[PDB]
Amino acid sequence: RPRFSFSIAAREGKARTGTIEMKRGVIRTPAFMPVGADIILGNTYHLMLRPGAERIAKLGGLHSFMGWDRPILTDSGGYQVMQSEEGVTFLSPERSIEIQHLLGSDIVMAFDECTPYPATPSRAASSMERSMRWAKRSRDAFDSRKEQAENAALFGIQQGSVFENLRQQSADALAEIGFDGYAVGGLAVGEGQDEMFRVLDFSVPMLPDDKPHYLMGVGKPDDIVGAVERGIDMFDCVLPTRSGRNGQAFTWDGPINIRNARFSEDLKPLDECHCAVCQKWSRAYIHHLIRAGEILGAMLMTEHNIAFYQQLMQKIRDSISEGRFSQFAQDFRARYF
Amino acid sequence: RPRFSFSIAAREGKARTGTIEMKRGVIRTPAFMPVGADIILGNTYHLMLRPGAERIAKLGGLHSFMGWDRPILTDSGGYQVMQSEEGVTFLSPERSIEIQHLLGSDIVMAFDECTPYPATPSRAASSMERSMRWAKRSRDAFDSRKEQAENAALFGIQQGSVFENLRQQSADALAEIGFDGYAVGGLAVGEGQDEMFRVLDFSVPMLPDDKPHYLMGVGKPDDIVGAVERGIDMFDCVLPTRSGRNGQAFTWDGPINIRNARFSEDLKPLDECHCAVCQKWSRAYIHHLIRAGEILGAMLMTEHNIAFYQQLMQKIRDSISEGRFSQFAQDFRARYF
Numbered sequence: 247r248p249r250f251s252f253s254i255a256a257r258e259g260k261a262r263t264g265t266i267e268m269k270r271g272v273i274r275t276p277a278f279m280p281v282g283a284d285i286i287l288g289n290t291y292h293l294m295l296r297p298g299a300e301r302i303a304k305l306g307g308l309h310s311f312m313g314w315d316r317p318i319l320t321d322s323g324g325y326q327v328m329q330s331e332e333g334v335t336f337l338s339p340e341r342s343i344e345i346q347h348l349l350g351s352d353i354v355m356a357f358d359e360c361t362p363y364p365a366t367p368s369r370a371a372s373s374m375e376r377s378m379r380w381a382k383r384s385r386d387a388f389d390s391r392k393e394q395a396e397n398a399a400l401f402g403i404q405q406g407s408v409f410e411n412l413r414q415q416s417a418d419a420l421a422e423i424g425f426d427g428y429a430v431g432g433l434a435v436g437e438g439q440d441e442m443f444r445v446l447d448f449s450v451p452m453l454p455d456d457k458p459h460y461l462m463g464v465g466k467p468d469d470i471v472g473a474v475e476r477g478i479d480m481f482d483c484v485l486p487t488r489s490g491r492n493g494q495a496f497t498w499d500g501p502i503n504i505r506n507a508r509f510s511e512d513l514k515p516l517d518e519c520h521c522a523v524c525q526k527w528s529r530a531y532i533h534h535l536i537r538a539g540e541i542l543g544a545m546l547m548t549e550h551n552i553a554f555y556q557q558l559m560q561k562i563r564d565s566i567s568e569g570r571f572s573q574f575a576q577d578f579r580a581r582y583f
Numbered sequence: 584r585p586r587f588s589f590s591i592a593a594r595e596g597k598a599r600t601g602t603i604e605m606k607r608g609v610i611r612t613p614a615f616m617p618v619g620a621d622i623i624l625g626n627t628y629h630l631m632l633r634p635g636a637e638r639i640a641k642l643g644g645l646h647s648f649m650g651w652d653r654p655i656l657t658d659s660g661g662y663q664v665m666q667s668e669e670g671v672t673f674l675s676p677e678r679s680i681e682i683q684h685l686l687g688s689d690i691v692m693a694f695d696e697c698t699p700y701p702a703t704p705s706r707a708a709s710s711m712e713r714s715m716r717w718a719k720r721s722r723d724a725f726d727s728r729k730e731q732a733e734n735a736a737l738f739g740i741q742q743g744s745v746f747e748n749l750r751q752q753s754a755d756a757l758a759e760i761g762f763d764g765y766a767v768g769g770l771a772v773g774e775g776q777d778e779m780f781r782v783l784d785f786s787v788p789m790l791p792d793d794k795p796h797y798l799m800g801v802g803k804p805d806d807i808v809g810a811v812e813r814g815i816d817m818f819d820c821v822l823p824t825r826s827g828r829n830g831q832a833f834t835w836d837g838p839i840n841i842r843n844a845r846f847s848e849d850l851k852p853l854d855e856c857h858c859a860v861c862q863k864w865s866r867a868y869i870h871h872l873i874r875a876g877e878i879l880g881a882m883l884m885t886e887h888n889i890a891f892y893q894q895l896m897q898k899i900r901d902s903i904s905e906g907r908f909s910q911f912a913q914d915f916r917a918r919y920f
């Protein structure tokens with residue numbers, strides 16, 4: 247395969263389905279990228295602290311460390327961290343790119359500033375302006391490392407808060423630098439779904455149509471369906487894994503809190519779900535394990551949620567390919583809510 | 584298969600290897616019985632409290648509840664609980680047998696009193712005497728339930744503390760009642776390995792040779808090898824699963840605490856071990872997951888320890904079958920310590 251190639255196989259409205267080809271593998275889009283599926287996320291911020299990026303490189307890089315030979319995406323670390331034009335003390339475009347290089351990730355994120363919400367126009371603009379200068383610094387640092395430039399890909403991240411004119415300026419800046427893909431940053435920071443969708447309505451068409459669009463940090467199943475409706479191709483969120491660790495399971499009928507006493511005699515599987523948990527165990531038994539404090543319970547729940555998310559993405563891909571994504575979205579919504 | 588049949592295929596010293604045939608499956612001996620492998624343990628005490636034995640029966644019994652169709656052993660619940668000749672308030676021979684019937688277990692334990700350590704002769708004797716009367720009550724209650732009598736098996740439990748003459752009286756009493764198998768109770772209660780082995784040296788030959796011998800609550804890998812040397816056929820212990828949840832892994836070189844900083848760059852697998860964890864991941868990565876508080880780490884550790892214990896039992900069975908168990912024990916010991 248090539249270093250990076252994105253091809254769109256089918257469309258419905260603003261929605262797209264296709265593939266990203268990379269040296270380590272093919273990623274079907276729209277894609278859900280679970281935390282460390284066709285691609286997983288590494289935790290740059292944690293990893294730079296323990297055991298350190300250099301120690302990971304000493305151990306062979308993140309693929310060999312975690313035994314995952316497929317692509318890996320890493321964030322640039324600042325979201326998590328959060329200050330001067332140089333970067334942040336507690337990281338800078340150059341160091342962030344270096345760390346991601348040492349980790350050996352396949353998709354590298356530019357070092358940006360995730361603007362707080364709410365933000366005034368002036369603050370959002372100052373912030374987005376710094377992020378675009380850091381984006382150029384990120385590009386140059388990436389390009390200066392041969393192994394990285396030739397084997398990895400770099401995504402730029404749009405900022406601008408909820409302001410159309412700043413989103414436009416940011417998209418323009420990013421397209422002028424040039425990236426392999428374009429993330430929509432600065433959302434899923436407490437604005438609520440209606441506002442997020444409003445910003446996505448005008449923001450995603452500003453990005454190059456022929457490159458992947460990544461919505462960082464999103465989200466709930468209904469957030470993902472709505473974002474795909476608005477042209478997003480890639481997603482990440484810890485919700486499946488946090489939820490798993492807190493008693494909540496995703497189902498096509500909505501999320502359920504399995505610890506509730508209502509499940510204590512429920513012999514149905516958690517969800518339709520083809521997952522292995524759902525192949526063998528009842529709500530009643532997972533309820534029991536979790537109430538008992540057993541690790542297995544937490545484990546089964548997480549496995550289920552991860553699999554649910556991938557089944558959702560597969561349903562989304564198939565429905566766009568078949569020209570029935572609009573109907574799927576409506577039916578999804580009817581049942582989930 | 585028959586309700587219960589124990590056959591001894593090979594011997595070396597006091598050590599034996601063979602099989603127990605039951606309706607739900609064959610159990611290779613010496614056997615390690617992990618908590619809910621050829622057989623697993625259910626948690627009578629927990630289950631009677633949540634969701635209740637009747638609720639489990641309502642849900643189809645423990646096999647269907649936990650999705651395990653192979654044999655299941657349950658303890659009688661008092662060990663865990665801990666008072667009159669009737670039983671204990673907080674359970675009695677009859678209620679204990681009823682609960683185990685509702686749970687649908689294949690191997691049922693008599694309701695006994697696990698004598699505290701240390702015990703004076705008089706106290707040990709009074710206690711063992713009550714246990715033998717409860718053993719007879721257990722037998723009668725078991726035999727009164729047709730489905731149980733015809734499909735399950737009942738083991739009696741020897742008491743008597745560390746006193747030879749009381750162990751003898753107890754063995755005599757149990758053999759006069761008649762059981763499918765004989766457990767050695769009252770050990771692994773703080774006496775230490777030298778004292779446990781001393782009691783086992785005289786206590787196991789007192790039991791019927793042609794029935795299985797179960798040492799309840801044992802134990803560490805070296806405890807198991809020594810007990811098999813002394814004629815024990817079956818073991819249970821939560822150590823693999825507790826240990827897993829606390830950072831400790833069993834290896835042929837002894838246990839290791841994976842959280843120790845010494846493992847942070849160790850690319851070797853946890854252990855020789857054929858397990859799936861050891862097939863794919865390094866000490867360094869499991870160290871990382873556990874230090875990170877990730878459930879996966881705890882999970883991988885537990886899976887490893889369970890598999891280690893079953894590999895140990897397989898090595899023990901093979902070596903007795905091949906007439907080299909004596910040598911295996913010495914080599915085991917050399918390396919483990």
Ligand SMILES: [Zn+2]
Binds near residue numbers: 524550
């Ligand atoms: Zn499922």
Ligand SMILES: [Zn+2]
Binds near residue numbers: 857861862
């Ligand atoms: Zn292993």
